[PDB]
Amino acid sequence: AKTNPSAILSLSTVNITVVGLGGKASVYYNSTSGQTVITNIYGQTVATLSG
Amino acid sequence: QNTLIYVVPNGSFVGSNIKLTYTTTDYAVLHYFYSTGQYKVFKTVSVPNVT
Amino acid sequence: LGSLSSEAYYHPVIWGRALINTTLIDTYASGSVPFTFQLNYSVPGPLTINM
């Protein structure tokens, strides 16, 4: 990113926004743990699913 | 020799497509600019949806 | 590329099997002119050898 403009670019899927009336939740493949981090409206990582 | 025709069904004439990937003829395009995701190069033929 | 700002304005390059076109200047022959090539390669960076 910081060099070349864009090409096929990859992401830590560090979030997926799911806002509602109150708070938010997210189901986000965090490519810096290497696993599916799933968070909730309580705030916390509730599951963490390998690979 | 330098012509082509693509044929498709009577309904899937829209959403008909063709994928071109021009392929390297030098090994060493791979090196350190494989991470560009244009080592081998990527384009397509398409028919737009119109109303 | 985006790796090279303004210091680059001097560089001859080729890569691998991809073609460098050459200028084999020659005047001193008759009929078919055969040519042999010698290339001389060398490797930037320290060289430890495993044997």
UniProtKB/Swiss-Prot annotation, chain A:
Subcellular compartments: Secreted, Cell wall, S-layer
Tree of life domain: Archaea
Glycosylation positions in this chain: 15
Changes after translation: Glycosylated. C-terminal glycosylation sites are modified with a heterogeneous family of glycans, with the largest having a composition Glc(1)Man(2)GlcNAc(2) plus 6-sulfoquinovose (QuiS).
Subunit structure, interactors included: The mushroom-shaped unit cells of the Sulfolobales' S-layers may consist of three SlaB subunits and six SlaA subunits.
General function of this protein: S-layer large protein. May form the highly ordered outer sheath.
Family: Belongs to the Sulfolobales SlaA family.
UniProt-recorded name of the protein: S-layer protein A
Gene for this chain: slaA
Full-protein positions shown: 1120 to 1170 of 1424
Curated annotation (Swiss-Prot), chain B:
Assembly: The mushroom-shaped unit cells of the Sulfolobales' S-layers may consist of three SlaB subunits and six SlaA subunits.
Name listed for the protein in its UniProt record: S-layer protein A
Function per UniProt: S-layer large protein. May form the highly ordered outer sheath.
Source taxonomy: Archaea, Thermoproteota, Thermoprotei, Sulfolobales, Sulfolobaceae
Residues bearing attached sugar chains per UniProt: 10, 49
Subcellular location: Secreted, Cell wall, S-layer
Entry comment on modification after translation: Glycosylated. C-terminal glycosylation sites are modified with a heterogeneous family of glycans, with the largest having a composition Glc(1)Man(2)GlcNAc(2) plus 6-sulfoquinovose (QuiS).
Family: Belongs to the Sulfolobales SlaA family.
Organism: Sulfolobus acidocaldarius (strain ATCC 33909 / DSM 639 / JCM 8929 / NBRC 15157 / NCIMB 11770)
Superkingdom per UniProt: Archaea
UniProtKB/Swiss-Prot annotation, chain C:
Compartmental location: Secreted, Cell wall, S-layer
Glycosylation sites: 21, 40
Superkingdom, taxonomy of origin: Archaea
Post-translational modification: Glycosylated. C-terminal glycosylation sites are modified with a heterogeneous family of glycans, with the largest having a composition Glc(1)Man(2)GlcNAc(2) plus 6-sulfoquinovose (QuiS).
Quaternary structure (record): The mushroom-shaped unit cells of the Sulfolobales' S-layers may consist of three SlaB subunits and six SlaA subunits.
Function: S-layer large protein. May form the highly ordered outer sheath.
Family per record: Belongs to the Sulfolobales SlaA family.
Protein name per the record: S-layer protein A
Natural source organism: Sulfolobus acidocaldarius (strain ATCC 33909 / DSM 639 / JCM 8929 / NBRC 15157 / NCIMB 11770)
Record gene name: slaA
From-to range in the entire protein, with total length: 256 to 306 of 1424
